[PDB]
Design a protein around this ligand. Structure first.
Ligand SMILES: COc1ncc(Cl)cc1S(=O)(=O)Nc1ccc(F)c(C#Cc2cnc(N)nc2)c1F
Length: 252
């Protein structure tokens, strides 16, 4: 009703667990937005947790977080709509798959912005827990916007499987970022078999094992950073701030 009156639909962006993300245009302001539509059971524990994650994520304000506009409910069927910024340059996934790894200046900047975003999220006492390239978006100016926290997951620090830590502390996101930065640093992995094996070989308990064509004079710094992020022991991963301040990262 409000969704159909105020917006025009343009494009399916995604399908999650129980919901869709639709690219829409607002009739009044003429701007494109991404709207997530979640069918919801009102008065269920699932719902009341979702409403909590909405109150919590609505309070995030950072240049590297997808910008939040609006949340509302519509009516023997119920929908939750969440209106966010539409990011014109799609996902980090598309950018990795399109040969990001050959642009060392660019991928070092994008890595830094992801860190900016994680540092802010961690400073606010929150954890993403679902960090992966399809959940990092790129705006028209090629800046990182993190989103898709997941409304059914607790993001309060104090309370697909290839990005998940052996384990819930702040340090789960930084393990994930170690997998992500390897994919940013390495050639697009055409096949599923290559993807799963190469990444399972990083996540190997007995120290991260890199492919034969990464053990190079070229990818020395990148190797250090990832090895640090991918430590089995969470207490031995750096904080986003600790890494940001490190002189492993090239100049901004
Ligand atoms: C900061 O995140 C939040 N903040 C506050 C709250 Cl209330 C919820 C969240 S959320 O974590 O549920 N994210 C979320 C929710 C809804 C969405 F439509 C999107 C999107 C997108 C998108 C996809 N493709 C392209 N190209 N551009 C943009 C999203 F990311």
């Amino acid at each position: 009703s409000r969704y159909f009156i105020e917006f025009e639909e343009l494009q399916l962006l995604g399908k999650g667990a129980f919901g869709a993300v639709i690219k829409v245009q607002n009739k009044l302001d003429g701007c494109c937005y991404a709207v997530k539509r979640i069918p919801i059971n009102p008065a269920s524990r699932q719902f009341r947790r979702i409403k909590g994650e909405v109150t919590l994520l609505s309070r995030l304000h950072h240049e590297n977080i997808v910008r939040y506009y609006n949340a509302w409910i519509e009516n023997a069927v119920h929908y939750l709509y969440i209106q966010m910024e539409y990011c014109e340059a799609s996902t980090l996934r598309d950018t990795i798959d399109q040969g990001l790894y050959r642009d060392t200046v660019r991928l070092w900047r994008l890595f830094r912005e992801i860190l900016d975003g994680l540092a802010y999220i961690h400073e606010k006492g929150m954890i993403h827990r679902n960090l992966k390239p399809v959940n990092i978006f790129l705006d028209s100016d090629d800046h990182v916007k993190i989103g898709d926290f997941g409304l059914a997951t607790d993001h309060l620090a104090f309370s697909e499987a290839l990005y998940v830590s052996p384990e819930y502390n702040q340090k789960v996101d930084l393990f994930s970022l170690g997998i992500i930065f390897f994919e940013m640093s390495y050639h697009p992995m055409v096949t599923a078999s290559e993807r799963i094996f190469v990444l399972n070989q990083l996540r190997d308990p007995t120290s991260p094992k890199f492919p034969e064509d990464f053990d190079d004079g070229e990818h020395a710094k990148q190797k250090s950073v990832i090895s640090w992020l991918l430590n089995h022991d969470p207490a031995k991963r750096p904080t986003a701030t600790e890494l940001l301040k490190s002189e492993l990262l090239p100049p901004p």
